Design a protein around this ligand. Sequence first.
Ligand code: BGC
Ligand code: BGC
Ligand code: BGC
Ligand code: CL
Ligand code: CL
Ligand code: CL
Ligand code: CL
Lengths: 551, 552, 553
Amino acid sequence: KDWWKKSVVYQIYPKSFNDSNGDGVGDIQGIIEKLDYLKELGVDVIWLSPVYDSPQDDNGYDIRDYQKIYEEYGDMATFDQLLQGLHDRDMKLVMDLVVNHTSDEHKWFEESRKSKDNPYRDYYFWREENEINNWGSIFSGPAWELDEKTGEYYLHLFSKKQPDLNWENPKLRQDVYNMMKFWLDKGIDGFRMDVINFISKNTDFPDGPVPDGQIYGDAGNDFCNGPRIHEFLQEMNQEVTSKYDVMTVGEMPGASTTDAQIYTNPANNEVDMIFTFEHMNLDSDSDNKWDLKPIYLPDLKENMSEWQVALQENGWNSLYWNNHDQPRIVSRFGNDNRFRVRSAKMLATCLHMMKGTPYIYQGEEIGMTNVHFETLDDYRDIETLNMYKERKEQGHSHESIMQSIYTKGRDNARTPYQWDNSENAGFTTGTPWLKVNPRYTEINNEEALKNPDSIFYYYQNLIKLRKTTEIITTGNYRLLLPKDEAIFAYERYTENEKLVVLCNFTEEEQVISDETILNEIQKGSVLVNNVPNIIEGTLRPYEAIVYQIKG
Amino acid sequence: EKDWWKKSVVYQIYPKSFNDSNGDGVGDIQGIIEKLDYLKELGVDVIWLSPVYDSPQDDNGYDIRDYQKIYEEYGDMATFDQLLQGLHDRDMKLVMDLVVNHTSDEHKWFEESRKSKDNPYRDYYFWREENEINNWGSIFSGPAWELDEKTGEYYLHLFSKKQPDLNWENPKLRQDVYNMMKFWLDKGIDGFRMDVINFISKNTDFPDGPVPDGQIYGDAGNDFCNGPRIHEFLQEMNQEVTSKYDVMTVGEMPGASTTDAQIYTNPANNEVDMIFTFEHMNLDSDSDNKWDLKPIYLPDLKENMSEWQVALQENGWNSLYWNNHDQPRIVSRFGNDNRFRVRSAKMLATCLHMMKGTPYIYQGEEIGMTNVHFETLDDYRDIETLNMYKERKEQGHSHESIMQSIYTKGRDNARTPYQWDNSENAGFTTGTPWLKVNPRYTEINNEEALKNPDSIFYYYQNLIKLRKTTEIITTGNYRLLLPKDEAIFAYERYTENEKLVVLCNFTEEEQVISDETILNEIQKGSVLVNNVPNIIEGTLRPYEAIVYQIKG
Amino acid sequence: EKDWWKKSVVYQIYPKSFNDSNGDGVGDIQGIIEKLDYLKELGVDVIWLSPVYDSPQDDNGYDIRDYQKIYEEYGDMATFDQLLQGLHDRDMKLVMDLVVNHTSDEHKWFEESRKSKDNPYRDYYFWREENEINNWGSIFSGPAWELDEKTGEYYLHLFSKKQPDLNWENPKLRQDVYNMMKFWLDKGIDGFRMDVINFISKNTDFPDGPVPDGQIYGDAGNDFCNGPRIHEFLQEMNQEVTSKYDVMTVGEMPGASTTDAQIYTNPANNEVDMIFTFEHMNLDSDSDNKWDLKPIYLPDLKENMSEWQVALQENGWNSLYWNNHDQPRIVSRFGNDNRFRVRSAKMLATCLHMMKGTPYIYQGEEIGMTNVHFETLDDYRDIETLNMYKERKEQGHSHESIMQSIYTKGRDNARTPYQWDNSENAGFTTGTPWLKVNPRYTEINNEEALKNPDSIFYYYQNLIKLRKTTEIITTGNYRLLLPKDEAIFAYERYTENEKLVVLCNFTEEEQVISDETILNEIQKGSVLVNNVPNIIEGTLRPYEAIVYQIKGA
Ligand SMILES: OC[C@H]1O[C@@H](O)[C@H](O)[C@@H](O)[C@@H]1O
Ligand SMILES: OC[C@H]1O[C@@H](O)[C@H](O)[C@@H](O)[C@@H]1O
Ligand SMILES: OC[C@H]1O[C@@H](O)[C@H](O)[C@@H](O)[C@@H]1O
Ligand SMILES: [Cl-]
Ligand SMILES: [Cl-]
Ligand SMILES: [Cl-]
Ligand SMILES: [Cl-]
């Protein structure tokens, strides 16, 4: 019952995990060969990013056939061996459910676009010129694309090759549910529902207000947090997910804590846990992630704490620092040179001692870092490449745009996993689809396993603690020292037990003077810590300590 | 008239950069229509329009997605038709590029070809298994063979990965090309420049070539360039298509021999009307690689240009050009582009236009547009330049030297927007140009040139007049004089009864002629055209050109 | 006022044919003075007076014998001065022709030039030995080179043998021209129309032109027209002369392109204020020869006039005209000069006057004077017509064909005396007119037009008033609508928050507009001016013109 509450999730980005056949792209057989490694790490759920047939405009999040394995990754037989190899090790597989949009090469759209009278016409959003609006695509340019075959425009929130599905159409909804049953019948263990709060559109498509110094209109709630999301999730649960023993994660940019309480209340049978972005958008000037601003620690703490408090009673949180859409955490919030190992362990402690299901992104467990290519042409992500063109046309300097890519680009997360110190870090024997970070000579899985002080062993130990330390699951959460600009301190608590978690987010020594904390830690024992020979009441540079107090 | 193209003067338009009429930053067909009276006033009678065909623009229109459709940014077919009729109304003609060595990978033929080994279009291109590819490199860097995961075979591309080569061994492909040509010729276009048309006969065994010391890729030689079937294919094309229309055909042929050119351009052979060669366009290089810079040595230039004059004078025909969309601008390359810009541009015009052949004026050449010098690669655009930068940087070449190679040879030198006036972006656009305008536009522009009677414009206008009125410019044979001189390019045009003696100083130093025979001719001749007033008999002042006519 | 000429309406007087006050049968200056009240009532503010300079009249005054002397038949300097002052007293202005491509052969400069090869004035003109002439033809037939037996050399004349071309390569000649200009500008004249001013820079090598099949003379190309020094000379003239006075300048430039005119008329270049072009006057011809007739095709006319609008709207300025002393009368040329004469004249006036530029009204246009059809060549007068007849007849054209060419394109169409009333010779003269009055004067005349409230006169009076009072007529940009339509000339004028939609039927056939964009626009507008009462919205009756004004917020 609710096995997913104590799970630790490891996210694999299959294009970049392990190439087993030398073509430069990771494949499913490459994953199968590392199952004993993941078992040794101690994770029990694998979230596999899309391996479905796709022309790869958005690296698999543009699906051309939901029930086919993309040929570069392998075949269905290889997928089945992966699923079986996981189950053989009492591990589980979660896949992405990508149903806000399809590839424009999906047969539904190939048909839809042919004629106003095609029976798939209303699977997508088609409008005449005078009925489009001023929305922009999340990947730059307008959100409406003209199709000369019918003279009408289709909606795409993401790329031109990712036309949005029309969830107002009940035949589309049932087709999606039948597709889900195909995978669930195979025995997969859950879905992450991608941008699932984007599926309820305002079909009037009104113009948005254009903010000062912008081109496109702010959609408000006209696609995000629309009125029918709960209805659709309930319908999906009744028709599909209620019939299987699976976990569901709702990826919902812009969903409030109030909304998330509804989504994750078990009595509503919508989703099991929420996946939010509020902690991923604080190091920006405005809503545009490319407009950089340094993180202010109290903002981070307040935001993460709000989510803890809002869902602790009967909701559930996904806990994560990074994934295939975010810069690598040790570079983003840690120090990625002199204190790379230490600050990576600090960040891991801070997240894993919260209430929720932790997500480890591939390579986080070995402290992989952001990448800094000198030129745009080593980058690959459509988002980055489109942003470059647009921000350049708006007058941002090359230097400025490259800085934004360095700090926020998704390719930071996608450079191939660094296995060893051989050519291309042992990821491939060919030429990788995206260059390996040259720091693989320092930062690699082989070196991490050889070094007992490595980030790997620390992650292995944190995962173990989640199995043996009940309060990590059962405790409520409370933020301490809310305004401190250097220390992230909080407690986990039940009636007769406490954890006090103390994390230095800076390279400067911090002396705790708060007398309540100093008296608590005197009666506690150290559960885990990242720097030996603790000076009680002090946090050395990037130090993390967790005290356990019983009573 | 019979062989009208012999006396024609061609003006080449690079449509992306000529004139933007709607403010999106790219040149368009309506922009060209607005300047037809300017072109007529210059006196050109043939416009060579670079590709406006539908294309994703990987190689700015030389990667064709639909041969019979106008690229939307340039206009629609109705606007194209207005350009053609507009030229015809002014007794001008339109020539376009025939780009049939390769298509875009987005062309429907390749879309079909790549699907499966049994697709009816499979052998429209060259598909090979891994152990059957060879070691050729692409002209735009990297290997000439690209893997397609759809079938697991590799396709050949001599140019970009998005320019798969067509298989001329396939007779159905040849007929489809011929039918496409008829589409255009039926509309009344006046000719074709047949692009790299000597690249279409491949050795389909694709053997490896020899890899020279310090290189990666094999030299193909005759296994794609000047293959055995070029004469056959040109004869076939002429019989099926071009013989049926009153049109001019130009064969673009890198590395063609004069021996084959004599055959190609003999009217009795019904192959092409004239040849477009490159003997004079890669001499300022260490060896075969244009990016390895070497200053021009004048006797090399003179030998090479003269060889082609002599080879084809009896019954063949040469295109005469200094520059185009593939070359640096001539005043910067071989002239002086500052204190003797106007004078040296006039010299260079004289030198070319007094040769035997059909002159080509590239847009902006007539106002002395110059090379461009951007600080960063970020302001460059050409796939060839961008791919070269990446390849040479990876091989260990210095950023500094790579940039100098771009400054001297980069194709974007030719592609910066035409400089119409001194208004913002030189009056090319009211928006943001697709490629930055050269900052010298405030001094170098069409308006200033039209206002100044001493400008390069009026000098070109006058050379065009002279070709119309001076028969020897067309009918004369050619001989090179002073072949070893490092400063003076001297040559003679001659008929049975009269001569021209053309004297051009390629240097900024005074050159006093010591050749007794030239001095005798100077003494008895009259001056036909000259670029510096008050000639000193027997002397060429810095960048001076003089043409003497002897008719006694 | 700043750039006053932008809002001016110019009325062109052809003085030989306007009004004879003394009874010798030729119009005169006192005759013009007598009509100042009439001209003011019409509302024009600039008079362009064709040449009244001393001239033997080989080309009716465009062959000048003395630039600073009034031709004695027209009056004296005192009478000229009275005309200038009389205009100024009514807040009206006087523009004259600057005729400096050529002079009369009776001009003192040429009388001196021709005397010997070493005369100080020799190089005021173009003299060549027989072996150094070329094959050009005169614009008025025959060769462009004339032998003078005094020296055995030939002189160049683009126009008549009595119009030798001035050599603008000579700086002494240029300064003499500038001093002459100052004589007139010091008297307070308000501007110059610079006649064929793009002919003044010759290719002094005088190359042969290509001779078309079935021809004798070589095409001159750009070897007298559009020479390299025109901009230079215009700048020099501007800085020495015209910049020192508050005057308007007009460049008459056959063959100058839109591109070239953008340069000439850009104020930053200090050349001329506006261009006067011919492209719309040369469309109803089979080729470059105006006498080879072809009916007008409306889309050609629309495209050409629109090209000039769009080309010059940003920085430059157009002269707007349908006719003058060199053209057939417009109601006959492009309108209907029978039952729909009044309606079609009003349509044509609307079409031109709602464009961007300075409108020119030719004398008699405002009462719908028409072309003339004399049965015999002996009633014609113009040197161009009489010379053409002889040349075309020797070339094999039939008498009947040549007469048709004269009826459609001859300049005397424009030169028959102005029709004042229904008295003898239409009240132009008590004597024998120099050129016969059009016999339609009994029905078409100024007095009838003033008495008739529906006349063409009141329509022109109102169009002139609209230009004074309706800002957008001056400030609006222009764009052509319905470009392919063979019957309707439709266009819009537009500013930030205002539009005019101009709809003119060039045919005798009813037209129903189906264009949704036009129909929607005109529903939002009000009628600014129209020539037929009881409009049916979206329909144009035969020769109907309607202008809608649409005001935004
Ligand atoms: O498909 C649009 C987006 O959907 C999100 O759920 C994925 O995490 C992104 O990687 C993707 O670009
Ligand atoms: O298409 C490959 C090449 O072909 C040549 O004919 C063109 O002039 C080049 O601009 C082009 O890059
Ligand atoms: O003098 C030659 C010509 O010059 C033009 O400017 C006049 O308008 C004509 O009437 C005249 O015949
Ligand atoms: Cl269908
Ligand atoms: Cl996109
Ligand atoms: Cl490429
Ligand atoms: Cl005469």
